[PDB]
Ligand SMILES: Cc1cc2nc3c(=O)[nH]c(=O)nc-3n(C[C@H](O)[C@H](O)[C@H](O)COP(=O)(O)OP(=O)(O)OC[C@H]3O[C@@H](n4cnc5c(N)ncnc54)[C@H](O)[C@@H]3O)c2cc1C
Ligand SMILES: Cc1cc2nc3c(=O)[nH]c(=O)nc-3n(C[C@H](O)[C@H](O)[C@H](O)COP(=O)(O)OP(=O)(O)OC[C@H]3O[C@@H](n4cnc5c(N)ncnc54)[C@H](O)[C@@H]3O)c2cc1C
Ligand SMILES: *SCCNC(=O)CCNC(=O)[C@H](O)C(C)(C)COP(=O)(O)OP(=O)(O)OC[C@H]1O[C@@H](n2cnc3c(N)ncnc32)[C@H](O)[C@@H]1OP(=O)(O)O
Ligand SMILES: *SCCNC(=O)CCNC(=O)[C@H](O)C(C)(C)COP(=O)(O)OP(=O)(O)OC[C@H]1O[C@@H](n2cnc3c(N)ncnc32)[C@H](O)[C@@H]1OP(=O)(O)O
Ligand SMILES: [Cl-]
Ligand SMILES: [Cl-]
Ligand SMILES: [Cl-]
Ligand SMILES: [Cl-]
Ligand SMILES: [Cl-]
Ligand SMILES: [Cl-]
């Protein structure tokens with residue numbers, strides 16, 4: 001079948017590649033509105049920090065290389081502006097020439113992702129971070145203006161990674177956020193180490209703070225404070241790239257995302273949606289779920305490839321919402337329903353704080369593990385872990401437990417790999433099980 | 438009920454403690470033949486390495502403290518010499534007075550563990566490592582003799598830990614082993630980094646090598662080599678501490694271990710056996726298993742506590758055999774049936790070697806993950822991982838998968854916690870699943 005893909009990055013390029021693995025005959029074309037395909041989204045903060053300096057890590061392919069390797073046509077600077085689903089074409093604007101044209105399809109795969117929100121100020125010193133064009137612009141502005149003082153707005157995982165990287169680059173960032181709800185995927189009372197790490201390094205922060213006005217480099221804040229900054233990086237949320245979809249017969253929810261079934265099919269025949277744009281359900285509970293992260297983009301890409309060119313019995317089983325971020329010496333990871341969703345259940349919480357490994361063993365650090373379970377069936381609803389060591393390990397194990405419908409009580413039976421550098425004869429996970437009841 | 442426990446360490450002290458949690462009324466007495474209760478068996482190599490300086494780390498309790506906190510009576514230097522099972526008493530030798538007496542019980546819990554094997558040479562320079570007395574003796578001998586050159590006999594995981602610690606303490610060890618099967622719980626080909634690490638630090642080793650004769654500090658070997666050594670640490674296996682049990686009605690296997698049911702009951706009413714002395718079965722396959730490690734001692738301790746004083750529907754579900762060792766920069770972890778047990782199945786092997794985390798993120802290293810599955814039912818039989826980073830995480834996840842008899846194919850569905858320092862959007866675990874078709 002002739003396959004058209006919208007968006008040439010985490011969902012879209014991956015999906016096209018997976019289809020080509022299975023099907024060497026079909027024509028495949030990807031439209032991408034911006035300059036680059038296959039940029040490494042998650043690498044971008046580290047490019048800014050000069051931690052990742054090799055351009056070959058910042059993006060995997062140019063369209064020419066992608067074609068030479070996979071015989072997939074990718075048209076960059078081509079923006080899909082409408083889906084004409086009744087005639088099975090999309091309308092595409094060639095942004096170089098400013099001319100539009102129709103492209104026909106047998107199958108259409110939508111992976112347009114999300115765009116960064118803006119505070120809307122008229123400021124030449126303000127930047128958002130979503131792609132490699134943005135990353136290049138920030139790097140160039142830093143060099144062109146000998147940037148020293150940077151204001152980082154927003155305290156989600158992206159902003160936090162950007163702040164750490166600016167600091168490691170030798171710059172002097174200040175963090176602000178409109179509320180005290182930093183790193184919102186993590187339990188609110190488990191995020192203190194973020195603030196501790198800022199304090200330890202004398203990196204200023206102000207919560208419940210906002211930009212009030214901008215006059216050149218002079219920034220006036222909600223608090224009344226007035227400061228001079230060389231640069232501003234705004235991390236104030238994202239919005240779905242779905243305006244171009246609205247006129248079509250594809251069903252969008254009220255927030256602008258596309259609900260899909262377990263085959264990642266939209267309501268319209270022959271049209272799939274994957275990545276940040278798509279909404280589905282949790283695997284472990286009967287609730288809607290949207291998890292705009294790389295795992296889901298890649299898993300959906302594989303499932304859609306099977307649907308189109310492989311084993312079409314392969315279907316999604318839902319999200320668990322596993323997520324993680326590093327901030328300086330600490331790891332913050334969680335899985336399951338969001339804190340705000342716990343209220344839809346009768347639940348209990350159990351927690352343990354213990355060394356990540358043998359107490360007598362050096363380099364030890366306190367790991368805090370928390371587990372919420374449903375009182376009606378003893379099933380695990382949510383888990384969260386924060387510490388310098390071992391948090392990723394405990395959360396991945398719990399993700400696998402939830403995949404298997406394990407009860408909190410069965411955690412006593414988890415057989416951990418124990419030697420002094422790694423865990424305890426009764427691991428934190430076991431202790432959750434013992435402490436439950 | 439009046440409770441008597443034999444052995445006051447990983448299984449015994451833990452079980453007594455767990456019973457007290459549930460039952461504050463019953464009299465509990467533990468007999469321990471040696472000087473110390475509750476010593477940290479797994480810390481001992483690190484005490485030798487002076488990595489653990491604070492001897493407070495090597496001993497968790499004295500009998501006086503145990504009685505103060507838990508009202509449990511522990512008698513050290515008291516060796517149980519016979520079980521008079523029909524009258525429900527044990528015969529106990531007070532090793533300080535050399536007088537024996539009988540102690541009655543309503544319930545008897547055997548956790549006598551295992552003793553170190555010896556090569557049987559008449560040598561004052563040779564030591565084995567099993568308890569804190571042994572650790573003290575080794576440390577004292579090193580100081581008294583200004584030991585430099587040390588012969589480490591045996592290449593099992595504990596001997597390897599002893600070798601590393603001697604090296605880091607500043608001594609010069611040589612490793613020998615009677616066969617080429619070093620670190621035998623791991624796949625033989627995946628053990629190469631042990632030899633690499635030895636070579637990198639110019640630590641000599643000889644496999645298929647044995648001591649032929651000892652004449653003072655002059656050691657003659659099977660190879661014909663003659664070398665001078667200041668000290669020898671023999672790690673040549675262990676044997677069950679069951680000689681005192683043979684006259685009783687308790688059934689022992691041909692190797693001297695005690696088969697138990699899933700309640701850790703022996704064949705004799707009111708007598709339980711836990712820890713290294715006990716044999717059981719695998720959880721995921723129908724085969725006998727013996728896994729003489731700390732997790733199993735602690736888990737059995739809790740189950741027996743519930744049987745005696747708690748919820749008597751709580752039973753063991755079998756072992757998976759999860760195990761792990763660190764050797765210098767590398768981690769070696771495995772779970773499931775042993776290499777020699779694979780032949781009892783029709784099986785296939787899948788493997789991947791990939792960076793532990795995102796390739797662009799600094800400090801990466803290649804992680805080798807291998808999974809064996811049963812061709813009759815796709816179920817995971819065994820998994821092994823070796824690398825500088827991430828091996829413990831992958832093997833713990835697969836232990837949780839096997840606990841639920843998960844299939845190899847379902848690994849594609851595992852939802853990893855992904856950010857660049859930790860994994861990949863398609864994790865090594867996912868890749869095993871994708872590669873299994
Ligand atoms: C700085 C940063 C750090 C991140 N770190 C992590 C992390 O550590 N872990 C994690 O799991 N996730 C992380 N993410 C999120 C992750 O990158 C996303 O979940 C993933 O990119 C989603 O894939 P996608 O295909 O839906 O969107 P994208 O990868 O953003 O690609 C969508 C593409 O569609 C194009 N497009 C949109 N509309 C049109 C149109 N009408 N016509 C043509 N092209 C169009 C866009 O220009 C864009 O290039 C990070 C994201 C950012 C920006
Ligand atoms: C140096 C070393 C390192 C180790 N490292 C690890 C590791 O990294 N990971 C892991 O999982 N396991 C490790 N182990 C193994 C672990 O310690 C055992 O599996 C665990 O101790 C078993 O518990 P147990 O109660 O059966 O035996 P033990 O803990 O050895 O206790 C048994 C006790 O019973 C006493 N006893 C025996 N007979 C009598 C009698 N007739 N009367 C009175 N008392 C008696 C003994 O003197 C002994 O103190 C290590 C063991 C050693 C020696
Ligand atoms: S934000 C976090 C993640 N970042 C992003 O995703 C950024 C944008 N990513 C993309 O654009 C695509 O993911 C790109 C990078 C374009 C994918 O193309 P690649 O050529 O780089 O990677 P491929 O998936 O095409 O294949 C690479 C190798 O990995 C193994 N492999 C992939 N898929 C499978 C499956 N389904 N089954 C078994 N193995 C698979 C392969 O061994 C493969 O190399 P081979 O040539 O097949 O040996
Ligand atoms: S070689 C590797 C293993 N070898 C060893 O274990 C060495 C010898 N070990 C022992 O002697 C015992 O294991 C000792 C050290 C005496 C400890 O016994 P317990 O395993 O029963 O644990 P503690 O009584 O010392 O309590 C410590 C903390 O763990 C909590 N806890 C234990 N058991 C439970 C149960 N069943 N349910 C809920 N919580 C439990 C304790 O309450 C305690 O928490 P703290 O806040 O640290 O007090
Ligand atoms: Cl990436
Ligand atoms: Cl139309
Ligand atoms: Cl705690
Ligand atoms: Cl220990
Ligand atoms: Cl008798
Ligand atoms: Cl039996």
Ligand SMILES: [Mg+2]
Pocket residue numbers: 084
């Ligand atoms: Mg129209």
Ligand SMILES: [Mg+2]
Pocket residue numbers: 353354
């Ligand atoms: Mg504590």
